[PDB]
Amino acid sequence: DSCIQFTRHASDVLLNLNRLRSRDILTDVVIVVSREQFRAHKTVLMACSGLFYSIFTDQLKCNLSVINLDPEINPEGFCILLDFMYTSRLNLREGNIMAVMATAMYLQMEHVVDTCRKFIKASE
Amino acid sequence: DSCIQFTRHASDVLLNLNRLRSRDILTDVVIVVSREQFRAHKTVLMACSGLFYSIFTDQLKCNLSVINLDPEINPEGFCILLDFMYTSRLNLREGNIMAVMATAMYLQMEHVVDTCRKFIKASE
């Protein structure tokens, strides 16, 4: 086509989606990770995670307001990944890399799994 | 912070949101523009438009499944802008620029209004 493109549009959209998350506006699901609860937008979760995409395209699960993750999932690892979904920034640290990678594999977040594997390979 | 960032994340999220729109997955509102109907995600509309942000943060309007736009709004102009919201690409043409700018002013999409004003100023 003969379209023009606004370079910052996708980033500005995500920044606004994160502002809605921070103010709990139009969040439509709670993700339960053991004793912790995380409110989010189903569409954003699906856009970032192969697991959430599969869950919310399921004709029965699409209507659930609460999703319980596997008990092996670490709440901090999930929190770091949820922040990444809404900001593009990943708080990857020596103390959390194993939990973050395990959570990203479960959530099916391929690019996160890739950088975790590379950061781990560098420290061995 | 000491975060790392994935450059393409925001673009990949928007591409996935557009895929959900194309398959009518988790769309939660219909925008009526005269005889035409457009299905969309309230969160994406709010993230792109000052008008939709104001509408869906209203304690009563937040719960509506149908929003009727002002009858002066052109359905093609709205369609072009809805595509822009989900892709960052604007199909701006001599034949549609006036309708697109009028629709972007109504929807409160400042960057679109800015490029329309510049493209119009160049042709005078």
């Binding site: 379209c3 370079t7 | 604007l90 490029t115």
Partner: peptide, 4 residues
């Protein structure tokens, strides 16, 4: 704005 750019030519994509």
């Amino acid at each position: 704005w750019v030519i994509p």
